[PDB]
Amino acid sequence: SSALTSYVSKKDLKNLEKKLEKNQNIGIRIYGDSHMAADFFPRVIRGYLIRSNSIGFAYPLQPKYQQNLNLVYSYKNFEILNSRNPANAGHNFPLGGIIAKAKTKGAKINLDTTLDKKNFKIGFLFKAKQNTNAFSIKDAKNQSYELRTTQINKWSYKELELDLPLQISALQKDAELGGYFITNKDNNVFLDTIAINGAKSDLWLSWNQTVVKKELGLLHNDLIILAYGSNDALFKGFEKQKFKNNLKKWISILKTYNKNAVIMLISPPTVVQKQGKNYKLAPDFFTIRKALYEVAKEEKTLIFDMHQFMQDSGGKNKWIEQKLSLNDVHLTIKGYELMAKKLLEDLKNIIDY
């Protein structure tokens, strides 16, 4: 039984179905929380839905316990600011809400790809307190560049053709990096992720909206996946109408800034909450699930229901015993891949690839 429900017009589905057939330009993006931020579910979609040849957007540094398997990072003397963190509130956050801030002059980040191909156009988002040079870039072919803002305390962008691996050196203390856009000169097929452990569906409201819109336009996506809900059920501040109204605002922005894109909601797995010494179901999870179906119908999206597949195959307790799921809300790698393979299966009922 399919856990995938479609409210998308046959036109947008047919358009996406032939994009995948032509294997030329296919940009996929997954927004979400911990169920996506370690790339376990995304890696399966990236490996089997498309023939990935590019990277797309990536954080300036991965937060702890997060990764994008297309890239490898190391760094010295940088601080990671995270929009999900209350301690980091009030900062001017870009898309994704991750900032790599230099603690000292000469702070460094080394960046490489796990792909065998090394030459890319790399767009850098950066910010500085002074209009002098902010960062120096040195790539594998010993090309040396500089990132320099024209207005201070303002997110700025610059694209360079570079060969990975590269080294980024801070030329100012407190200079900030906000992310990379790593693409080919043409015919880009990629699946990138903008996921944050513990993020609620409305984390995007925390970011600088004009910077977000600029970065949405820097790279077009043909299929956009929003996988939220678990943390809405676990933390303060849930109200059904605010939940829907914010999500529909975000979907509308995404459709407007990504013309003809298909949107997929992913409703969370069974969400459980620590009550006393045990884990019990979260009261709002059922409400969140219903609202997500309502937003999918209202906004003409697909919706993949992780809870429905879990329930249709024995329930969370069966998934715990078989180490497809842990006892809290998190699944294991084996569980996320099974989820991703299930979605690929259900996807064949509406589109071919």
- Check if the beta carbon of residue 132 is closer than 8 Å to that of residue 172: yes
Q: Which of 196, 259, 258, 260 is nearest to 227 (CA)?
A: 196
CB atoms closer than 10 angstroms to residue 112: 14
110: Cβ contacts below 8 Å, ≥ 6 apart: 73, 74, 75, 165, 166, 167, 168
Residue 287, burial from CB neighbour count under 10 angstroms (0-12, 13-18, 19+): middle
The ranges of the chain annotated as CATH 2.60.120.1360 are: 57-185
Name the architecture of domain 57-185: Sandwich (2.60)
Distance CA 189, CA 211 (A): 24
HSE toward the beta carbon, residue 326, CA cutoff 13 A: 8
- Check if the beta carbon of residue 120 is closer than 8 Å to that of residue 182: yes
Residue 139, burial from CB neighbour count under 10 angstroms (0-12, 13-18, 19+): buried
* H or E element that contains 183: strand 176-183
> In a 3-state reduction of DSSP, which class is residue 273?
strand
The fold of the 1-53+187-353 domain, in CATH, is Rossmann fold (3.40.50)
Structure resolution, Å: 1.8
Question: End-to-end distance of the chain based on CA atoms, in angstroms?
Answer: 20
Distance CA 274, CA 183 (A): 43
Token duo for residue 349: 């009922």
The ranges of the chain annotated as CATH 3.40.50.1110 are: 1-53+187-353
Residues 12, 18, 19, CA angle at the centre, nearest 5°? 85
The dihedral through the CA atoms of 221, 225, 226, 228 has a sign that is negative
Q: Which residues of 159-180 are buried (b: 16+ CB within 10 A; e: fewer)?
A: ebebebebebbbbbbbbbbbbb
Distance CA 8, CA 162 (A): 39
CA distances from 27 to 188, 219, 257, 258 (A): 7, 8, 13, 10
77: Cβ contacts below 8 Å, ≥ 6 apart: 102, 103, 104, 106, 107, 108, 170
- Check if the beta carbon of residue 201 is closer than 8 Å to that of residue 229: yes
284: Cβ contacts below 8 Å, ≥ 6 apart: 232, 233, 238
**Helices 240-257 & 283-298, crossing angle to 10 degrees?**
40
Distance CA 221, CA 262 (A): 9
